[PDB]
Design an enzyme around this catalytic site. Sequence first.
Site, PDB file in Angstrom:
ATOM      1  N   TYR A 148       0.881  -1.298   0.174  1.00 47.86           N
ATOM      2  CA  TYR A 148       0.063   0.061   0.091  1.00 47.86           C
ATOM      3  C   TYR A 148       0.920   1.167  -0.036  1.00 47.86           C
ATOM      4  O   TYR A 148       2.054   1.137  -0.636  1.00 47.86           O
ATOM      5  CB  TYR A 148      -0.993  -0.164   1.048  1.00 47.86           C
ATOM      6  N   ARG A 165      -7.338  11.807  -5.169  1.00 45.36           N
ATOM      7  CA  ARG A 165      -6.227  11.888  -3.986  1.00 45.36           C
ATOM      8  C   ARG A 165      -6.569  12.724  -2.762  1.00 45.36           C
ATOM      9  O   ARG A 165      -6.910  13.932  -3.191  1.00 45.36           O
ATOM     10  CB  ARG A 165      -4.773  12.201  -4.654  1.00 45.36           C
ATOM     11  N   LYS A 179      -6.329  -1.482  -1.103  1.00 42.76           N
ATOM     12  CA  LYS A 179      -7.002  -1.230   0.144  1.00 42.76           C
ATOM     13  C   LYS A 179      -7.885  -2.607   0.407  1.00 42.76           C
ATOM     14  O   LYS A 179      -8.086  -2.952   1.742  1.00 42.76           O
ATOM     15  CB  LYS A 179      -8.013   0.040  -0.095  1.00 42.76           C
ATOM     16  N   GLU A 186     -12.295   5.970  -0.501  1.00 42.27           N
ATOM     17  CA  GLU A 186     -10.768   5.964  -0.304  1.00 42.27           C
ATOM     18  C   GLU A 186     -10.275   7.003  -1.387  1.00 42.27           C
ATOM     19  O   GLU A 186     -10.711   7.030  -2.503  1.00 42.27           O
ATOM     20  CB  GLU A 186     -10.193   4.335  -0.750  1.00 42.27           C
ATOM     21  N   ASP A 187      -9.360   7.937  -0.899  1.00 43.47           N
ATOM     22  CA  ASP A 187      -8.544   8.871  -1.570  1.00 43.47           C
ATOM     23  C   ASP A 187      -9.256   9.701  -2.187  1.00 43.47           C
ATOM     24  O   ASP A 187      -8.993   9.845  -3.456  1.00 43.47           O
ATOM     25  CB  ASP A 187      -7.647   8.062  -2.396  1.00 43.47           C
ATOM     26  N   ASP A 238     -12.037   6.134   5.189  1.00 40.66           N
ATOM     27  CA  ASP A 238     -11.071   5.728   6.212  1.00 40.66           C
ATOM     28  C   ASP A 238     -10.090   6.960   6.322  1.00 40.66           C
ATOM     29  O   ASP A 238      -9.699   6.873   7.495  1.00 40.66           O
ATOM     30  CB  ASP A 238     -10.086   4.367   5.542  1.00 40.66           C
ATOM     31  N   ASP A 239     -10.174   7.672   5.299  1.00 41.16           N
ATOM     32  CA  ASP A 239      -9.056   8.856   5.370  1.00 41.16           C
ATOM     33  C   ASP A 239      -9.454   9.677   6.339  1.00 41.16           C
ATOM     34  O   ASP A 239      -8.625  10.234   7.288  1.00 41.16           O
ATOM     35  CB  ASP A 239      -8.808   9.648   4.043  1.00 41.16           C
ATOM     36  N   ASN A 298       2.645  12.908   6.345  1.00 45.26           N
ATOM     37  CA  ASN A 298       3.662  11.960   5.113  1.00 45.26           C
ATOM     38  C   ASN A 298       3.657  12.808   3.824  1.00 45.26           C
ATOM     39  O   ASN A 298       2.701  13.626   3.590  1.00 45.26           O
ATOM     40  CB  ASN A 298       2.945  10.552   5.275  1.00 45.26           C
TER      41      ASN A 298
END
Lengths: 542, 542
Positions: free
Chosen positions: B86, B139, B155, B226-227, B249-250, B397
């Site tokens: 991932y 993103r 994922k 996701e994303d 989830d983010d 990150n």
Amino acid sequence: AILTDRYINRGTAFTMEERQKLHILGRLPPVVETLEEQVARVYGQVKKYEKPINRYQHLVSVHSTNTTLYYATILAHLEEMLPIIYTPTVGEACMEYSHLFFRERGVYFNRLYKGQFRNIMRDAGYQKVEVVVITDGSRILGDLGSNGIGISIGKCSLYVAGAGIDPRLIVPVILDVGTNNERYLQDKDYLGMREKRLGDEEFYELLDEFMEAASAEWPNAVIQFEDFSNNHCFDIMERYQKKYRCFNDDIQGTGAVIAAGFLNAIKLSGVSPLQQRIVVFGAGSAAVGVANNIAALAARMYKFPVQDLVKTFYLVDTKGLVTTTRGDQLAAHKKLLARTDVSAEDSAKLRTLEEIVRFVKPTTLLGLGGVGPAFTEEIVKMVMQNTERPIIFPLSNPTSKAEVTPENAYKWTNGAAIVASGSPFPPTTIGGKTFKPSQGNNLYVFPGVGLGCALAQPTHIPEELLLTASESLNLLTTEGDLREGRLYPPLEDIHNISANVATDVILEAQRMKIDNNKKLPRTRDELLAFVKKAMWKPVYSG
Amino acid sequence: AILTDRYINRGTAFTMEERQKLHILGRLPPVVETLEEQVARVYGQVKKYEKPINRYQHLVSVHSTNTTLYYATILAHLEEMLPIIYTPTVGEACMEYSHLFFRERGVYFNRLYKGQFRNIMRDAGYQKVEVVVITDGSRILGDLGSNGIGISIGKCSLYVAGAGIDPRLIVPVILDVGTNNERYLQDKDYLGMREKRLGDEEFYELLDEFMEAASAEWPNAVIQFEDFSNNHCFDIMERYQKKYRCFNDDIQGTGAVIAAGFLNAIKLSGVSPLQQRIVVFGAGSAAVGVANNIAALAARMYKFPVQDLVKTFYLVDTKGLVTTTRGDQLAAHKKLLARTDVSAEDSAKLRTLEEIVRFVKPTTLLGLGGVGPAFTEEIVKMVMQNTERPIIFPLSNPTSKAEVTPENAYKWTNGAAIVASGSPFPPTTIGGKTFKPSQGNNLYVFPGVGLGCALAQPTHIPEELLLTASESLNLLTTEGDLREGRLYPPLEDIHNISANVATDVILEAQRMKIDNNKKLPRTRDELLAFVKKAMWKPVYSG
Ligand SMILES: O=C(Nc1cc(S(=O)(=O)Nc2ccc(OC(F)F)cc2)ccc1Cl)c1cc(F)cc(F)c1
Ligand SMILES: O=C(Nc1cc(S(=O)(=O)Nc2ccc(OC(F)F)cc2)ccc1Cl)c1cc(F)cc(F)c1
């Protein structure tokens, strides 16, 4: 069941209406490509990897998903792909990356399965198998043991690409009789028979069982021996050549390709076959086999007495010029080409290649030596004294073991040298004139022999069928190819080459009445047309 | 049909007697391995590649051949594999190597298929789907467009590894609404919708159709976003959270994991939750969401008035300390955490992080800033004046964007700092004492939420289920884990973590009467046992 079948999967080449009809709409991104477009895309994907092993790894993944697209990509970039999908990348993949072969359909034999070989073949579930490639991993020249399966896999794929053997009708085989590779014998991750190589008696017991089982269960197959060590490869062909449908590409393929190129080099040199003085640098069984194949082909195409052609050859071993007056007991294979016309006193002074070249005044240098770059600037300049068109064949591989680079051969002869190589080289330009060596790739011959033997079903493969394939290849080099200094038809035309080679091999099996398939035409134009239609083509069919 | 089915294939783990019974003797090399041995072999194969992308490429090939062996290898080396399978390797594979995702079962939607979404799902041929991961490639933080399918694929695989979602019962989805990636828009090999991203109206028309189709055709599924980009991710959850079984989830996963680790950091610091003075470096919607999740969890576990917990937070945006007296019109999300107890005169002098830290005298620094290494040696030394155990969470990150390295945090505090990271770091040794940051990996929470929502079948996923998962994770950190300075249970125990998280999420759905599955136990010990047996396990079953 559509996408997941690598034989019928088309990926993005499924039209929008096909995707709807097949209930796979939304299983693919929306772009619809033609096969040509898919090939261009895959080619750019290959080239985003720098290392040959990672390019091969990508191509393995393409083959697993879309087999038609894999073969279409290879055929569109054949010259460039050949070194990735076979020698030398394939041996490096076997030796260090054997996992790249795990998903490929193959058959694994060893002594644990003695007396079950036939049952194992039946259980593999093939239909009318046409080609089987077998190795023991021993290497014609790093002992790979069981990891030799990758050599059989790579070679089978060249039959499919080169002659359109149907990819469902070819079997890669490893006969694991152990390994003398000490790293492997100690490696926790070696999956093969963890013992040293079996002695000859047990070796032939298992290989006999293999030959007899295959002849029963795969009766329509050609059995091709690949990458067997010198202690066995010649003896295997003596044992089986008459009894079974079999050949060895390393021995018989090589000689057929080199002879075909060499006779075209003679045509371009003007120096006719009986006027050639040929130094054969290297005197192993293989090197002498190539010399003998040259003689045999010149005798077939021109009806010179083969004895007169044998006297054009000057054989050089590690002691020097091979002669009857030298004083040693010659190995059997060296006797036939030994000079009878050189004195004991002269033989004593014919040891170094430079002094042999000065004495013999050769017009050709054949590099089959597997030692250094022996064809020095000084040696090439001496050959220029004996002919306007030196023939220089640096055939030893890898490219480091080669007797001279084509570039040096062309530079030192100012473009006069006629050159064939074992490996691809870039063009060399001298004074605005471009020169490029002709690569004697084995792909010119084995696929066409496989396709011819698949169609004709001969009882066996006598030397006449290899000599016919050699001649057929020679005669495919067009007046135009010859005017441009090519010794072979272009590699990229391998389908047409294979169909012509196969046609001529079938006509020879028909002349000898060893052909078992009575459905084939018996006249060349009609047979060539029939052979072209029989070939599997990497196009979307249905 | 055995070897070629990646779900039942065992490769070399087939015993000699199985190979005989299944007629695959001779389809494998002769060594018979256990799964443990196969895993050790695959691990060495991964490590013969240097680059993360080529390690991932190897693991894709393992997954295609032997799915059980892929998941067994990941679970045996989870910490080391996570960055390969991932973030951040997966985004690099999507961006430059999208072909690595081609053979993975996924569903591709776009405007061309408007009104057919439900038919496309039915045609995909899944049984009782449990988890769907959807992205548009926009993103959360390089626009990948269609190549975002690789994010959904990666994922989904973490649900299978982390919580034993059956790999047949998970669906990766790309909603291709176009791409603003200019390279892709001009790239001949881009296979997606070659247009800029759709406006909001058309975006919601297609995403509404997706949500409604999935709720009909995959009624048992949890839908995980996701994303998705910040212009949509918050608004999507406001639109769907009550109507459908869905989470992001983010946003929600991150806050649940960080809150759980942070409360354990409070326990280790001795400085109790109402005594903490927390600098929240970064004031985006996500950063404020993490602060609010911390408050919510402290309020649930300790029954402090949430208003008192909100007053422990000092929010820092690009202008400085967020206060009611600063003079700007605050964004809605910043108002809740704005200081009311700082004068206009002080606000004017509270702009740089060093002067804010000097004034606030914080005991915690939370790094959610996505800017440089803002937590300087000087700032860390000031926090040492305010507490014996500074809590320092450099969570931005990549590792380059992080506010401070754990090594620097431990060195400057002489091992006093309590540290959680967004990324794995090696241990740091100071005076013979070893320190290692606790990684707040999202893998701690989403798998357990997926497995709990799969079992309980709640009508929707209210914030109570995320808060329960957060608390459950906090309480899994054992007295022993805490004595060794760990803020989370060990990642390698992810199955046990997921079963506990899932159990607690189910018990919360049961308390709210939103659970639709009346077969489940309603008491924790019996339910935990039932949840463990339900999980798919990467072992050879039959
Ligand atoms: O056909 C499939 N996908 C596909 C193919 C193509 S392609 O066939 O047009 N090109 C292609 C292919 C594989 C390659 O090699 C290396 F990358 F996978 C390289 C190119 C393009 C894009 C997609 Cl998504 C497919 C096959 C399955 F068995 C399962 C599945 F879920 C999808
Ligand atoms: O199962 C097969 N082969 C096999 C598996 C293993 S293994 O399953 O024990 N290990 C293994 C696997 C694949 C991997 O990944 C990357 F290398 F292929 C890595 C390890 C070992 C050795 C062999 Cl020959 C197989 C599957 C087919 F569909 C067709 C076929 F012809 C063979």
